[PDB]
């Protein structure tokens with residue numbers, strides 16, 4: 001897998017963001033995670049977390065997995081990095097997302113994220129409180 005450039009267009013929520021990729025605007029959905037919707041418990045906190053993580057980054061990058069790169073809604077499916085830190089992993093580590101939507105063929109970072117979730121749960125953080 002490899003990282004590719006992008007630039008933030010706009011925060012959206014815990015697990016989606018509007019980025020410019022290859023010069024085109026796209027909505028990206030984070031692989032392997034599920035954040036609460038904004039109207040649900042910890043939804044606001046998830047959205048705040050990713051808004052800050054994306055807006056503060058000097059360099060956003062996207063990393064597609066081995067499988068399908070867009071979902072049925074036209075959203076890009078990627079691992080997203082903010083100054084080399086994976087947003088997908090950070091969400092899970094903080095108890096602001098669950099590991100979720102693990103489809104074979106696009107699950108390169110599954111075990112990394114499961115390890116984060118375990119530590120979040122051990123610490124009883126957020127969703128796990």
Ligand SMILES: Cc1cn([C@H]2C[C@H](OP(=O)(O)O)[C@@H](COP(=O)(O)O)O2)c(=O)[nH]c1=O
Nearest residue numbers: 015029030031032033034071072077101103
């Ligand atoms: C994360 C992810 C979501 N999806 C689809 C499955 C779900 O379909 P349904 O909309 O039919 O439930 C939806 C979940 O996304 P959200 O959690 O953003 O709603 O997006 C994929 O197809 N591939 C993926 O890797």
Ligand SMILES: [Ca+2]
Nearest residue numbers: 034035036037
């Ligand atoms: Ca969601």
